[model samples]
Target: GVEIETISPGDGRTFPKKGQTCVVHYTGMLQNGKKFDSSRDRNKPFKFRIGKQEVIKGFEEGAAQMSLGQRAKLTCTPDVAYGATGHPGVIPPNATLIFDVELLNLE
Candidate 1:
């Protein structure tokens, strides 16, 4: 399981509360500094529904405890990131990831 660090703990309005849509504005990096995907570079947040498993576990888990205006960072080890079979040129295989994520939207 991925470890999540929650800020401002339980203000339900800024975090995902279930059966809602969520967007995480994030940048993905390797422990080695190759920036694979940056949602900011894409210039927008990425969207998905809560509890639907649409993203990598750590990204989803981090967002599960996320924020819209919180300054935080999530580092995801390969155990929680896409492993040797990740999206191949998209997400570096077996990448240990560092995610600068913001809960951009929730409703």
Candidate 2:
């Protein structure tokens, strides 16, 4: 199941499409609320190319629903996320991922 809460909404702006590189700020964590990474802490937004296997699938899915400058708290199931193996260091096996994300630039 995928659930999303739109926090701060973006201004009337562009919607990122699949395979686009998006600039974003996000806090990613497990369901227990332990954070694994955050672009905010680095004082920089992350640059990610959508549909890239480099990142989890769920986040790319959620970002597609957002316009520039939008914020959201999203939950992603194992199927669309890390799946049964999970991220080796950051996430436990079979863990579900939750993220607070801000869509910054869609380019």
Candidate 3:
């Protein structure tokens, strides 16, 4: 069984704090659990900073809620993850996404 881990209160809600870097390992899947991307599969981690808008809105929010070494499962609806326009040929319109994420570290 899976569970949602809640961060302690007063913990900085907006992570990366605008310009800070966030490195993580994540796996993304559809509602039916079909994987679309995975860092683990590549044996590498993904890195990016906040406020850079290098990633989607939902991913930034999920990273903000986590602490180093923490793990979280974020369910991002199309509205928050990827809007109606989506990624064109990559992601279908109005599709929901699920991310199993591991917060490896942040700087």
Query: How should the candidates be ordered by TM-score, best one leading?
Result: 2, 3, 1
TM-scores of the models, in the given order? 0.75, 0.84, 0.79
lDDT of each residue in 1-107, candidate 2, tens digit only: 65778876677468887778888888877776678888888987878787767776687678778888778888988887767776687777777888888888756
Could you arrange the candidates by lDDT from highest to lowest?
Answer: 2, 3, 1
Global CA lDDT computed for model 3:
0.72
Candidate with top lDDT is 2
- Candidate 3 residue-wise lDDT, 1-107, digit = tens: 12245434433344446687777888888887477888998887887777877788777787776777667887776786566787876678788777888776656
Off by over 4 Å in 2: none
Candidate 1 structure quality by residue, lDDT tens digits, 44-78: 67677877767777777776666566545778777
Assess each prediction's global lDDT (C-alpha) against the native: 0.67, 0.79, 0.72
> Distance from true position, residue 96, model 1, in Å?
0.6
In Å, residue 92's CA in model 2 sits off its true spot by 0.8
Task: Name the runs in model 3 displaced over 4 angstroms.
Answer: 1-16
